[PDB]
Design a binder for this molecule. Sequence first.
Ligand code: NAD
Ligand code: NAD
Ligand code: JPA
Ligand code: JPA
Lengths: 60, 60, 229, 229
Amino acid sequence: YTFIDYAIEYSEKYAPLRQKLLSTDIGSVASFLLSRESRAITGQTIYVDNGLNIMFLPDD
Amino acid sequence: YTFIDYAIEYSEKYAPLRQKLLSTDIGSVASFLLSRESRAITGQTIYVDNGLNIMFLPDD
Amino acid sequence: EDICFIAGIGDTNGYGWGIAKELSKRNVKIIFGIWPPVYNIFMKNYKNGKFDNDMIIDKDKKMNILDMLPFDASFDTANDIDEETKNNKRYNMLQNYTIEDVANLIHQKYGKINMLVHSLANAKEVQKDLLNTSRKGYLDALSKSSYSLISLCKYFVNIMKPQSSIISLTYHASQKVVPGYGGGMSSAKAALESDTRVLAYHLGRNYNIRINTISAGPLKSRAATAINK
Amino acid sequence: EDICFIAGIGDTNGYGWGIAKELSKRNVKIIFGIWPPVYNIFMKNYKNGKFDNDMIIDKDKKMNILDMLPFDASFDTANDIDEETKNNKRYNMLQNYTIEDVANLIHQKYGKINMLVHSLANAKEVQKDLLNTSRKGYLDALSKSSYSLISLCKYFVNIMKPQSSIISLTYHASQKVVPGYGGGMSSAKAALESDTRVLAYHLGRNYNIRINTISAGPLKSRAATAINK
Ligand SMILES: NC(=O)c1ccc[n+]([C@@H]2O[C@H](COP(=O)([O-])OP(=O)(O)OC[C@H]3O[C@@H](n4cnc5c(N)ncnc54)[C@H](O)[C@@H]3O)[C@@H](O)[C@H]2O)c1
Ligand SMILES: NC(=O)c1ccc[n+]([C@@H]2O[C@H](COP(=O)([O-])OP(=O)(O)OC[C@H]3O[C@@H](n4cnc5c(N)ncnc54)[C@H](O)[C@@H]3O)[C@@H](O)[C@H]2O)c1
Ligand SMILES: Cc1ccccc1-c1ccc(Oc2ccc(Cl)cc2Cl)c(O)c1
Ligand SMILES: Cc1ccccc1-c1ccc(Oc2ccc(Cl)cc2Cl)c(O)c1
């Protein structure tokens, strides 16, 4: 059942935010970065992933 | 001329982005972070600083 | 109909004000939490029209200020309030300014909110360097600038709708040494940035509420000028 | 009158598409650079309205697509096209698909643009783990997934107004190990997150143009599936 399915499953279980992660969730962040609203942000890696990246250990 | 004047002057000399950093520059970011547009971002430190944070060494 | 509590504003030269201005572009109702010692100065200045120009959102709206409330992030509940500030000239004529008291006041008056901003910091010994900072001084930095964010969260979560969102402000000194940023303010921001993560897991899992922090670059606000190197 | 070039759409199951949907919401004009291996088929499906349900921005808004162009990010200028791929079944019919050429094309039909999106990756040996990746495959991963960004920038930077903004997509395996993200894909994302800083310096100082990268969580796109694990 592949790599990406493990990935989705793990993220939907262990991420701070439980929602399914959607293409349009990145899309709207992309949209903000591309717009003038983010005129003072450059050179950054902005994480859009329901917060998974902050976790060290699982719980279960 | 105190510490903040040094920091503002350094920032404006050395940050990737040359413009004067306004409180509304930070405001438009907070606006976005507070909205549903950013539903998939959490637990992040987001840098709104005209990129200064990415530099190691100055040019002067 | 969205409400945002912005905790930490004494004037219009800081980040709290800029955040208020931009939220207004989206029609969000703004409530200010003001440190008691400067709350009356603020009301007066506001009443006397000193902020009228600063309130105009380009697009021909006035900033929609729902309310302005005294707020002191040193005090969680009514019984943390010490005797000397109970008799303090500035405090004793104000009431309900502890973090829990203002959660309740706001909820009683306007219902649930969905946006929270922590935009305040303090450290009695910011003028000293970390090595020369006392325990008392360090711990006041942490209490006022870092614990204050946890406490805000704990009291406000209950008056917020799910999917609601929370920010605070930080500074890169937490990660890279900036000499002059003393008194344990750097330590405080380090803690704040780590607490943002841990809070994000708890608030995220339990309430589907989000939390992030913005690491801003320098602006000449009141507190910034108060640093002094 | 914002115009965005989105490099790396092959269907409506990727982040490219989601980026196009959200950009429409803001009424920004969208131009797609499609890889020639899937170009004729994407065009065909679009023409047959396969993407009609997909182009629906709930708000009784239809996606608005300015143009659709063949585009291969391996190729900087026309002189970089080797004879074989030049003659290939898929490429033989198409033209102006190099990075330099699509820049010019866009600059002739529509003038300067102000938004640029890099939403593409590729790596011949993603299935192999880092230790077992060959030089060739590794360099392929960096070429296709990292350099392509830098080069997209060199050429598009001249058809973009000052104040324009550029973004790419990355993944956390650059910073923490995810076994199975092989082929030097992890290397390429590390390089891409480093080049994102360096480029932001050069682009900011010289062009007043900003660049950032989004590290996305997992999504079930076409490319995602091609990682046999
Ligand atoms: N100015 C900058 O260059 C800069 C850079 C990075 C981060 N920040 C952060 O921005 C935030 C807002 O500060 P600012 O620089 O806009 O200055 P500011 O003076 O506008 O705001 C700080 C506020 O905190 C309030 N405050 C202090 N102690 C309090 C307490 N015990 N209870 C309640 N309120 C209290 C003060 O009255 C003041 O209004 C702070 O977290 C600061 O660390 C500022
Ligand atoms: N899907 C995920 O879980 C995920 C997670 C993190 C990051 N990303 C990143 O997002 C980006 C988009 O990937 P996706 O998941 O949307 O997959 P996708 O297959 O939907 O998008 C990749 C697209 O790039 C195109 N492409 C590939 N090589 C090209 C080349 N040389 N020239 C021009 N076009 C080319 C392909 O035709 C394809 O349409 C990639 O950079 C990927 O690394 C994806
Ligand atoms: C000191 C500095 C140097 C460069 C950029 C910003 C800052 C900067 C300015 C004000 C800041 O806000 C404060 C600093 C110290 C204290 Cl006691 C209170 C506050 Cl509100 C800050 O945290 C950082
Ligand atoms: C590997 C992974 C694990 C968890 C979540 C996402 C991803 C993920 C899926 C597709 C991704 O995109 C690609 C990965 C490899 C290749 Cl060869 C091409 C692409 Cl477009 C990606 O960069 C990361």
